[PDB]
Amino acid sequence: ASPQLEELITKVSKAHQETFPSLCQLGKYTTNSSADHRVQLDLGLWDKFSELATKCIIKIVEFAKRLPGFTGLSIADQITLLKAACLDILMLRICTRYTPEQDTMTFSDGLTLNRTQMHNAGFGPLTDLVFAFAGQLLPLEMDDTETGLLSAICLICGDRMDLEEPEKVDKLQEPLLEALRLYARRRRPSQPYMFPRMLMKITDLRGISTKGAERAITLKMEIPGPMPPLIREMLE
Ligand SMILES: CCCCCCCCCCCCO[C@H]1O[C@H](CO)[C@@H](O[C@H]2O[C@H](CO)[C@@H](O)[C@H](O)[C@H]2O)[C@H](O)[C@H]1O
Ligand SMILES: CC1(C)CCC(C)(C)c2cc(C(=O)c3ccc4cc(C(=O)O)ccc4c3)ccc21
């Protein structure tokens, strides 16, 4: 149907893959830090978790700038969209790295934490709800292209508060929505509820990112200094 749409799919897929390695491509390793009992916070796991979060924020920015038209938005709007969506995309990303058989999540350096360690690294009381979100992503069996498109749709959203040109953002989102439906239906024609199910996960993701911002407030009181500067940028 449209060469332009096919190219958009290819571009978004490549941008995702090049900013987010697949679980299969990573050499996993583990830590024995606070591995068998939940505690309020393990500072060694927090330091590594938060370092890895900073690095992924920079990768999400890199991803965003590869999305067609994103750099043609005002710099203010680019920053507003990134602030509004980066926690959503972080959470989607980590949940895509869930290995159910071991109940672990894997970071982009290969660090593989069990559920107790994810709790102890900072998720705290939000841990099991995030793992349940990850578990309910599994039946969708999304591929990397679908994850990348969904991430783009989450980011390029015209409803965000304080956008200067929300209509322009909406027009950038339209082909991404078209692209995801076309791709998802082509890939699995006998599962036509996959596209609407994927879109409704954006709503679920917003709920868990809202809870994540609430957790950031209590976590701040548990750690001995401020959070890393790019995390604070995301949270404001
Ligand atoms: C969500 C809240 C964030 C809102 C937006 C604010 C974040 C702004 C990010 C702009 C980052 C500028 O990026 C600039 O320095 C980064 C860190 O040294 C470099 O980042 C480079 O190194 C990283 C390793 O540290 C790699 O993972 C990046 O892929 C690589 O490009 C950039 O190549 C350079 O262009
Ligand atoms: C705001 C703050 C600090 C506190 C509150 C909670 C615990 C909800 C939180 C969670 C995350 C988070 O889900 C995350 C972290 C690292 C990640 C690293 C990678 C990666 O290596 O590819 C991918 C996804 C990631 C996703 C980030 C920050 C925060």
From Swiss-Prot:
Q: Where in the cell is it found?
A: Nucleus; Cytoplasm
> Which residue intervals define the domain NR LBD in the entry?
4-236
GO BP term, example: negative regulation of cell population proliferation
Specify whether Transport is a keyword of the entry: no
Q: Where this protein primarily resides, as one coarse class?
A: nucleus
Cite the entry's keywords alphabetically: Cytoplasm, DNA-binding, Isopeptide bond, Metal-binding, Methylation, Nucleus, Receptor, Transcription, Transcription regulation, Ubl conjugation, Zinc, Zinc-finger
> Does Cell cycle count among this protein's keywords?
no
Q: Which GO terms describe its cellular component?
A: chromatin; cytoplasm; membrane; nucleoplasm; nucleus; transcription regulator complex
Cross-linked residues for Glycyl lysine isopeptide (Lys-Gly) (interchain with G-Cter in SUMO2) are 220
Query: What Gene Ontology molecular-function terms does this entry list?
Result: chromatin binding; DNA binding; DNA-binding transcription factor activity; DNA-binding transcription factor activity, RNA polymerase II-specific; nuclear receptor activity; nuclear retinoid X receptor binding; RNA polymerase II cis-regulatory region sequence-specific DNA binding; sequence-specific double-stranded DNA binding
Q: In which tissues is it expressed?
A: Expressed in aortic endothelial cells (at protein level).
Domain of life (superkingdom): Eukaryota
Assigned protein family: Belongs to the nuclear hormone receptor family. NR1 subfamily.
The record's subunit annotation is:
Homodimer. Heterodimer with a RXR molecule. Binds DNA preferentially as a RAR/RXR heterodimer. Forms a complex with PUS1 and the SRA1 RNA in the nucleus.
Q: What role does this protein play?
A: Receptor for retinoic acid. Retinoic acid receptors bind as heterodimers to their target response elements in response to their ligands, all-trans or 9-cis retinoic acid, and regulate gene expression in various biological processes. The RAR/RXR heterodimers bind to the retinoic acid response elements (RARE) composed of tandem 5'-AGGTCA-3' sites known as DR1-DR5. In the absence of ligand, acts mainly as an activator of gene expression due to weak binding to corepressors. Required for limb bud development.
- What's the protein name? Retinoic acid receptor gamma
Species name for this entry?
A: Homo sapiens
Organism phylogeny: Eukaryota, Metazoa, Chordata, Craniata, Vertebrata
* Stretch of the intact protein here: 182 to 417 of 454
